[PDB]
Design an enzyme around this catalytic site. Structure first.
Site, PDB file in Angstrom:
ATOM      1  N   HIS A  41      32.672  38.134  13.742  1.00 16.77           N
ATOM      2  CA  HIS A  41      31.850  36.988  14.130  1.00 16.77           C
ATOM      3  C   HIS A  41      32.226  36.425  15.497  1.00 16.77           C
ATOM      4  CE1 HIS A  41      35.131  34.550  12.128  1.00 16.77           C
ATOM      5  NE2 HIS A  41      34.876  33.750  13.147  1.00 16.77           N
ATOM      6  N   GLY A 143      40.234  27.947  15.916  1.00 24.56           N
ATOM      7  CA  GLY A 143      40.717  29.033  16.745  1.00 24.56           C
ATOM      8  C   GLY A 143      41.761  29.928  16.116  1.00 24.56           C
ATOM      9  N   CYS A 145      41.190  32.064  13.718  1.00 25.43           N
ATOM     10  CA  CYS A 145      40.597  33.299  13.220  1.00 25.43           C
ATOM     11  C   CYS A 145      41.234  34.505  13.899  1.00 25.43           C
ATOM     12  CB  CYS A 145      39.083  33.285  13.430  1.00 25.43           C
ATOM     13  SG  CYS A 145      38.252  32.336  12.201  1.00 25.43           S
TER      14      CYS A 145
HETATM   15  C1  LIG Z   1      38.399  30.615  12.559  1.00 31.14           C
HETATM   16  C2  LIG Z   1      37.910  30.522  14.016  1.00 31.14           C
HETATM   17  O1  LIG Z   1      38.697  30.194  14.825  1.00 31.14           O
HETATM   18  C3  LIG Z   1      36.438  30.858  14.409  1.00 31.14           C
HETATM   19  C4  LIG Z   1      35.915  29.928  15.491  1.00 31.14           C
HETATM   20  C5  LIG Z   1      36.315  30.586  16.820  1.00 31.14           C
HETATM   21  C6  LIG Z   1      35.695  29.862  18.015  1.00 31.14           C
HETATM   22  N1  LIG Z   1      36.037  28.452  18.001  1.00 31.14           N
HETATM   23  C7  LIG Z   1      37.325  27.968  18.480  1.00 31.14           C
HETATM   24  N2  LIG Z   1      38.205  28.744  18.933  1.00 31.14           N
HETATM   25  N3  LIG Z   1      37.595  26.540  18.427  1.00 31.14           N
HETATM   26  N4  LIG Z   1      35.678  30.834  13.168  1.00 31.14           N
HETATM   27  C8  LIG Z   1      35.063  29.640  12.623  1.00 31.14           C
HETATM   28  O2  LIG Z   1      35.100  28.588  13.105  1.00 31.14           O
HETATM   29  C9  LIG Z   1      34.382  29.871  11.309  1.00 31.14           C
HETATM   30  C10 LIG Z   1      33.252  30.952  11.478  1.00 31.14           C
HETATM   31  C11 LIG Z   1      32.503  31.233  10.164  1.00 31.14           C
HETATM   32  C12 LIG Z   1      31.300  30.622   9.830  1.00 31.14           C
HETATM   33  C13 LIG Z   1      30.694  30.887   8.609  1.00 31.14           C
HETATM   34  C14 LIG Z   1      31.292  31.787   7.729  1.00 31.14           C
HETATM   35  C15 LIG Z   1      32.491  32.403   8.069  1.00 31.14           C
HETATM   36  C16 LIG Z   1      33.092  32.121   9.283  1.00 31.14           C
HETATM   37  N5  LIG Z   1      33.754  28.767  10.627  1.00 31.14           N
HETATM   38  C17 LIG Z   1      34.403  28.187   9.454  1.00 31.14           C
HETATM   39  O3  LIG Z   1      35.485  28.616   9.068  1.00 31.14           O
HETATM   40  C18 LIG Z   1      33.723  27.078   8.633  1.00 31.14           C
HETATM   41  C19 LIG Z   1      33.158  27.956   7.502  1.00 31.14           C
HETATM   42  C20 LIG Z   1      31.866  27.598   6.802  1.00 31.14           C
HETATM   43  C21 LIG Z   1      31.269  28.562   6.008  1.00 31.14           C
HETATM   44  C22 LIG Z   1      30.088  28.280   5.342  1.00 31.14           C
HETATM   45  C23 LIG Z   1      29.516  27.023   5.481  1.00 31.14           C
HETATM   46  C24 LIG Z   1      30.125  26.064   6.275  1.00 31.14           C
HETATM   47  C25 LIG Z   1      31.307  26.349   6.940  1.00 31.14           C
HETATM   48  N6  LIG Z   1      34.677  26.169   8.098  1.00 31.14           N
HETATM   49  C26 LIG Z   1      34.947  24.995   8.900  1.00 31.14           C
HETATM   50  O4  LIG Z   1      34.416  24.823   9.949  1.00 31.14           O
HETATM   51  C27 LIG Z   1      35.948  23.966   8.383  1.00 31.14           C
HETATM   52  C28 LIG Z   1      35.238  23.025   7.399  1.00 31.14           C
HETATM   53  O5  LIG Z   1      34.820  23.752   6.280  1.00 31.14           O
HETATM   54  C29 LIG Z   1      33.794  23.165   5.524  1.00 31.14           C
HETATM   55  C30 LIG Z   1      32.638  22.948   6.480  1.00 31.14           C
HETATM   56  C31 LIG Z   1      31.846  22.790   7.324  1.00 31.14           C
END
Ligand SMILES: *CC(=O)[C@H](CCCNC(=N)N)NC(=O)[C@H](Cc1ccccc1)NC(=O)[C@@H](Cc1ccccc1)NC(=O)CCOCC#C
Ligand SMILES: *CC(=O)[C@H](CCCNC(=N)N)NC(=O)[C@H](Cc1ccccc1)NC(=O)[C@@H](Cc1ccccc1)NC(=O)CCOCC#C
EC number: 3.4.19.12
Lengths: 305, 300
Positions: A41, A143, A145
């Site tokens: 992703h 960040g 991930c």
């Molecule tokens: C883990 C990571 O660093 C990357 C972001 C990289 C770029 N940004 C920065 N370096 N600051 N991945 C995410 O942020 C990650 C991506 C994602 C989205 C959906 C499914 C899988 C992965 N997003 C999250 O981990 C979200 C996940 C999520 C999934 C389904 C529905 C809503 C959210 N989790 C959060 O942002 C933390 C709060 O969780 C509940 C909410 C909203």
């Protein structure tokens, strides 16, 4: 003496961490020989994560879209492919610090060390168990991930986890290094919730043996029970059933302490039924289930790598 | 999200760990530039520990009596000296993996990472706090001496602890990297009791801030307390006094949660008197005191 949640030395993995950037999105990658592994992703915008067509999104990307940075050195991407939920970036340069490694898929109840990283730089290391519901209770920020979990099996770094997401629960979800998620989760912004969790019974027993090795004996009683009777109690308290394979795995700790496994089960049954009597065990007022039997042996025997 | 006892990445320290052998006694040493630091009792027999005169035991030794192994590469010892309870072995090659580093002496309540090692090779990494009574509650087996505790700033490793001994109570005592013991302990097999230990109040508060940040709020109340009124209660439960310096240190967390420090003190006061009502905070049924305010910031 003493017993702490102990991680493996992280140096071998630290040398493998890089930063991967696609467009506006940056995260961590694992650099092993001439391939960098990272969550796929990274190729997605925030709008793509609503309904990502990863096969199509990757086709539209080319190598120059991928900026891989090993510290202050820019690694030239010369090939990109997708294995399930992991992106594989072939680079011009092989990592001279690549440890002897394997990719392994762990089972629920097993533990590993997590090397939390940001911008390709390691920040901290801690132990996690793969929960029965296939989440882990980690400590991760924006960040993180691409941070990886691993074990060191004698002379080999076994990578078993790459971080992909945080659930609304606040617990964490990711893949093995083949890109297959642990649990029923997907790298898309859609409804996702961890299933009902349970307590890892064989780990609790292993931890009680650790306490005995370290001098704690107040919870030992003169009773023993059957595997079936124990499991009737375990079910009442949301403990996973104990199998004969679990009993077998506890054999070395039972041998070391002279306490039969089903005797320890009788002690645990009493702790479950009547509580911990306001006392602590190895610094905890709760029964701890994130130590495997091998974790106990490793710590109390001074295994090195 | 989430909150965990986190250790620093251990790579920079791994590259400094070596094995030091003298006679039949082996332990770990720390190789920085062209000097290997290790506990001086590496020069003692099991019997010498009953009443050692280290100055005289060291006169009996030559450079050749010290076998230093970086893995299985022998490092030629060309000098040896003693600084307090540490031996400093001069070797003919500087460690190419020497990080930027400093030797620091830490206060009770400060935390650090331990890289537990045996025969010069790393076994595990965990986080520790220096207790008010100057012991640490580590995980150390036979042969762990010379393992070090450290913090990492920038990419500078600040070494603060070298392991020397386990007390009969199962807790651990050692020195800074200048060889000065923390607390009233000595490297001789004699009666030496650790003082009565107390709970690190400022760290408990920092951790309660951590819990609020992660959603736990059942313990929050609207009660109000003075700093002195709080300290009167904490003293009854063998908590360390909380000073205005501690209050200031918690400022950044109070700002983030919008919860005044003394209001958090009122929550802590109620938890000490009544208990936790069969409830938990950040997965614990005890008040955790081995996270500093900065640990809570760094992690969050
Ligand atoms: C883990 C990571 O660093 C990357 C972001 C990289 C770029 N940004 C920065 N370096 N600051 N991945 C995410 O942020 C990650 C991506 C994602 C989205 C959906 C499914 C899988 C992965 N997003 C999250 O981990 C979200 C996940 C999520 C999934 C389904 C529905 C809503 C959210 N989790 C959060 O942002 C933390 C709060 O969780 C509940 C909410 C909203
Ligand atoms: C820390 C270390 O590895 C070395 C071991 C010697 C060489 N390597 C191997 N055998 N692998 N140092 C000790 O073990 C250490 C030496 C010592 C003795 C006296 C004072 C300081 C240091 N010995 C201990 O840590 C003893 C210390 C002690 C001190 C005073 C009175 C009694 C014991 N502690 C233990 O062995 C732990 C067992 O509990 C002691 C009791 C009861």
């Amino acid at each position: 003496s003493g017993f702490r949640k102990m991680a493996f030395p992280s140096g071998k993995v630290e040398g493998c961490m890089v930063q991967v950037t696609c467009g506006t999105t940056t995260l961590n990658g694992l650099w092993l020989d001439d391939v960098v592994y990272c969550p796929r992703h990274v190729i997605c915008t925030s709008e793509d994560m609503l309904n990502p067509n990863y096969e199509d999104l990757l086709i539209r990307k080319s190598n120059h879209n991928f900026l891989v940075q090993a510290g202050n050195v820019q690694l030239r991407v010369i090939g990109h492919s997708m294995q399930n939920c992991v992106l594989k970036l072939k680079v011009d340069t092989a990592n001279p610090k690549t440890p002897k490694y394997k990719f392994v898929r762990i089972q629920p109840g097993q533990t590993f060390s997590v090397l939390a990283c940001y911008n390709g730089s390691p920040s901290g290391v801690y132990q996690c168990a793969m929960r029965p519901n296939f989440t882990i209770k980690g400590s991760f920020l924006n960040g993180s991930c691409g941070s990886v979990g691993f074990n060191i099996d004698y002379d080999c770094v076994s990578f078993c986890y790459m971080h992909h997401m945080e659930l609304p629960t606040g617990v964490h979800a990711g893949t093995d290094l083949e890109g297959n998620f642990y649990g029923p989760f997907v790298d898309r912004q859609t409804a996702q919730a961890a299933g009902t969790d349970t307590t890892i019974t064989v780990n609790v027993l292993a931890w009680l043996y650790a306490a005995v090795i370290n001098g704690d004996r107040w919870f030992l009683n003169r009773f023993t029970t059957t595997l079936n009777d124990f499991n009737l109690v375990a079910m009442k308290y949301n403990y996973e059933p104990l199998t004969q394979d679990h009993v077998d795995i506890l054999g070395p700790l039972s041998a070391q302490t002279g306490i039969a496994v089903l005797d320890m089960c009788a002690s645990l049954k009493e702790l479950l039924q009547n509580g911990m009597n306001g006392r602590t065990i190895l610094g905890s007022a709760l029964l701890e289930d994130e130590f495997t039997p091998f974790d106990v042996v490793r710590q109390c025997s001074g295994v090195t790598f």
